Amino acid sequence: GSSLSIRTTDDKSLFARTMDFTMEPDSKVIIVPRNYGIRLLEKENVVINNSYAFVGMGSTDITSPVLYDGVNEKGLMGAMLYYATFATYADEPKKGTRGINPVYVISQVLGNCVTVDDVIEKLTSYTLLNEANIILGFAPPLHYTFTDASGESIVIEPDKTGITIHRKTIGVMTNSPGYEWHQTNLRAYIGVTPNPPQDIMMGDLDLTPFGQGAGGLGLPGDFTPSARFLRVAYWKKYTEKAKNETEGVTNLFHILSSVNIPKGVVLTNEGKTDYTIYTSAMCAQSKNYYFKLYDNSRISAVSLMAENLNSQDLITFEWDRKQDIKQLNQ
Amino acid sequence: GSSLSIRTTDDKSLFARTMDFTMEPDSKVIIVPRNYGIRLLEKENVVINNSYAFVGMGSTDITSPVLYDGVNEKGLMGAMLYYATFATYADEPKKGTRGINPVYVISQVLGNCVTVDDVIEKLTSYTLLNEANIILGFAPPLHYTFTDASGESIVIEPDKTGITIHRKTIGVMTNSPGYEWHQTNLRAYIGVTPNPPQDIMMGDLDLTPFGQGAGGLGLPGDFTPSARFLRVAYWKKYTEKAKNETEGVTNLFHILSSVNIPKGVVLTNEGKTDYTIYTSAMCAQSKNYYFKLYDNSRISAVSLMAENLNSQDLITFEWDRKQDIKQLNQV
Amino acid sequence: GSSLSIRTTDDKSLFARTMDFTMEPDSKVIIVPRNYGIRLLEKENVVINNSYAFVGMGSTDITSPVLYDGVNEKGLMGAMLYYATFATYADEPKKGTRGINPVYVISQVLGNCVTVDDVIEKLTSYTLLNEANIILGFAPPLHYTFTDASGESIVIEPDKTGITIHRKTIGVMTNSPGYEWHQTNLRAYIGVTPNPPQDIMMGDLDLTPFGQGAGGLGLPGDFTPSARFLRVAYWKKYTEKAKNETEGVTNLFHILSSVNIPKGVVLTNEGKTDYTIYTSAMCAQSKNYYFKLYDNSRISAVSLMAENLNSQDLITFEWDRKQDIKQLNQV
Amino acid sequence: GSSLSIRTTDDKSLFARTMDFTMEPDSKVIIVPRNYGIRLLEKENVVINNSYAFVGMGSTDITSPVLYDGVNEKGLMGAMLYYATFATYADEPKKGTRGINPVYVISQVLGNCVTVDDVIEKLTSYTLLNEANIILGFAPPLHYTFTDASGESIVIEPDKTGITIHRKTIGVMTNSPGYEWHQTNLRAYIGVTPNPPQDIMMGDLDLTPFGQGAGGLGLPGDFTPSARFLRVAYWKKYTEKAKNETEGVTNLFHILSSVNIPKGVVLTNEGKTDYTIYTSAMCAQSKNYYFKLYDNSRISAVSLMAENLNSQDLITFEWDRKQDIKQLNQ
Ligand SMILES: CC1(C)S[C@@H]2[C@H](NC(=O)COc3ccccc3)C(=O)N2[C@H]1C(=O)O
């Protein structure tokens, strides 16, 4: 998948993520309220009490709410994205550390944390562990991005050297490899702009472009994580600033679109389709969650703030996998 | 912009296109009814009479309705797209031809034609002229694609040598250069697949890809016309066979999304921002014309087989330039 | 392979080409003298008589000398290169044409022609036939480039529609597809420059390139014909104006080096290894033909304006397939 | 520049390097014999006594022989290549370390070291220093590759974290960025082979390639260090094994050629040409040095073994910047 944060021009931070998977059963939008318990591991019993309510896209098939992204009531936003062959986990916690499940990292940070630093500290009392949840069958190689209300982003990744933190990132993350590497890849591609190369001659012949779009030459178009990072970064940089929160979601979906993967164009070596099952955006300041799906391109939205925050069970919706065409006449 | 037709499994032809421009003049959905009247030229009063009623996206700022694409009541779909530096027009009609404004051809084909050969034969009595319009300020360099209910597809292209007809096209079209050139560019990319590269060794070091989608390696990703064509064909090829009309409209919007241009990422020589104004799709069997827009990713649909098809007046629907977000709880 | 002509500042035209093949049959430098005799066809005994003597690389395994490229005593340079899937030949000559073996045209142009229009006009009396030879086993799909002492350049291309002449070419040619197609592909790469991209900021992070040569971003690097053409033209464009013949021969070999294929990096459908057998350059004003080879990066030169130009017999020079390393001290 | 080692099939290791610069005055091939002194710094006086004789391309304008590449008599081969914006140097040595000049690293390792491990050890009694030699005007951002007779390669690079060593590399190095990054870039490009993609159809149309060469699609062609690494790596991998030492030099020059830079096609922001001024190859087993230049494509060779190794002054040659065309007739 691919993610990014942007900064509205009326002091408002937004974060969006594409989920790319090989077939998505289930997954609703869950507001999880205060004082629900979120477990830490699955085969053992500790379950931290969340100070904060948050909301996002997740599962509900194991025993604590699993969230892939979300905003909590204090303006911190987050995602776990795949991260194949670079994710490393422990068997048992370290010294003065106790253990956590990759799939649980988000719920737990979003229920407890507010600043982006709060997340770096929280995550040195954690060692990630090699536990296979039943909804997949194994521990998804993951890495996490996060973004507080101020718009400062961070990437946390579980390498084999140990947990790697990157402060003050450019607010973009996709998938493997490490964020360090994508950030230096960016340089190879600085020539990719919105501006036309200027006309040339080859002897007597005059050479001018086929039409508009040529400043972009070099930018790869495949759906490889390295390219996906490249396009999301590069169209974040040049895309026009969003003046308001609605415009933010719109941009965020226009940029993600360049990396949105149709059914069938990417196969695995087993032979299943890898496609964009949904794509969402969240706002720090209003604590809104907006989302879109493969089978429907109408953004649905929940407001976390206008709900019973305090509050016996989780609140649920519930995917409309059907194209919501407005008929202007019958 | 960029286009293509696909065919579903319930025997249904569908054609979609994005429109890329530096600013929107007022456009709308326009239903043109039988016997309305469409000029050939802006400076002349000859007004040929449309046999058929149709529906598409168009302008209304000039004497007759101008359609960028759409579908008449006999299930013929088409569009005009930009075709810069290649498009050539006349000063006067060749002997035994009526002259025509290039912005008027879709209207005129869509009001009087049913099959693809109908359009081929129709443009023998025609000569594209160098006529301006008050909408843009000049005769825009265009070429045309068309797609009848059977699924066949063509490209009419006004070149320096004359009007060039390409028959049994793959049903994808972009902008310049000419259809044969793009059709031969496809060759240089046949190793763009949905499949993964095999693993290799470089000495004792093992190499396997970053995650996925490496079979696509070499597909360009910019928004030049020539890149768009590639994306649009290769992703047309591999995307899943659509099964119904609606899931057909989705596939089209997904395939087109790969070539949807956000504001600011493409600038002009005068630094105008070139972006996808709207995307539309239409169907031959239902005669339904769908569309989203830059600020509204919600699809609106218009049925044409439900209207006063012999109406005296145009039937039009204004743009909803407002992002139409559903509230799942009170927001 | 890949070719091009350049012009120096002491008013000298030079043409170089690489030859890419899956194995070398015996080839050599061949000086063909005036009045030698060159067949049109292998199965026929008509033997037209060469006005001019020339020199180039060729075979000797068939009844007449076969030249892949070279330069006659009137300073006309040329080559035949592969032209797969596009090249079309006859079964019989069109009315009022003598038939010819495609492998024989360079010989026949080089023995009887002086300027580029001479060659254009000459191939109106000609029809490429489908005639095999015992060297390769079949009529190879080819096209031809030519370059006279004035610097002008042309591409003769045997298409399905017929023989296609492109005049005032940029003087670069590769393999397929057709010259117009490559000439229009150049457009999609005009932002391949020797200049650095400007520095940018992405938020607060500063970006500047890895070292150098980033203006080249987007130039493909594979050994498809279409890539080679690009490399060869853009590096023809920017490389430094050569000042003399010899430094002219170097530039050519440098520009060609970018498209020189090492053994094993390109395989065939039957898995034959396709590699650059040799590179040659020749000059119009000196009538000197230069060449290195895969195993000998040392250039050997043959002067033609020093021989028995009316000799009864061929004059030939065997390949030195031995890397010719200088010993600066006793090695 | 760009470099690589290959392994002959008769138990013989060879290493070649392209030198890319913005104008090359001077530079001969220098055999430096045993018991010559090689300084360590330029403004201060320590000068280590070399156990071994070696030979390569270098300068002779400062006060100790500067070598860019070479082989010593014990079969170790080496190069310094540029390394812009990633090279970091100290002002003063560390603890138990004393100081060295980037330009001197090669002479000194090649005069003293035999195994590739010998080089890792030697280089933890060294801290590189910020001293501006007169032939350039400043300390060239450098990084070093090395290769012993056994064919095991290593890359040493001076990062800002400190000196970075990579063991058992793939035997390829160009320029920035770090070797770690190029090695993981390699994966993005595994699809680049010698084999044709197989034919496809688009509806009724048949699609087959323009001709031979299409397995290579994706490989970039620019002269950027990242691409240059990519081509040198990828054509090293697929190029046919060299059966003997002569064939080794030939391959090594056929592979380097793909990354050999013509005059004029690369400019700097000041506006000077950046071109390949020479390109050389060396053998572990025979201790031969072979070289080629921009203006001449005939390989000249020195044999280190057939010289006075022991031995008052340096031995010199001396560039023939003139195309050595054999005339087969006058
Ligand atoms: C005056 C313009 C800014 S608008 C007109 C025209 N159209 C567009 O920009 C619309 O999109 C394109 C789509 C494909 C190729 C070229 C352009 C074009 O080019 N134009 C510009 C130009 O020529 O500078």
Ligand SMILES: CC1(C)S[C@@H]2[C@H](NC(=O)COc3ccccc3)C(=O)N2[C@H]1C(=O)O
């Ligand atoms: C089990 C799987 C079907 S899913 C897992 C992995 N990931 C995905 O499909 C998710 O999508 C990604 C897309 C790009 C980069 C990383 C991940 C992959 O490859 N996998 C497959 C595999 O080959 O085992």
Ligand SMILES: CC1(C)S[C@@H]2[C@H](NC(=O)COc3ccccc3)C(=O)N2[C@H]1C(=O)O
């Ligand atoms: C001083 C210089 C002319 S040389 C220095 C640097 N390097 C080179 O020209 C050498 O060539 C390289 C080529 C590729 C990567 C790294 C180096 C560069 O850029 N430079 C120039 C600069 O811009 O200051």
Ligand SMILES: CC1(C)S[C@@H]2[C@H](NC(=O)COc3ccccc3)C(=O)N2[C@H]1C(=O)O
């Ligand atoms: C029989 C062959 C291996 S040799 C013949 C022919 N030529 C080459 O491989 C020479 O190089 C080329 C140069 C440009 C385009 C195509 C080929 C070709 O293709 N051939 C091969 C084929 O068609 O498989």
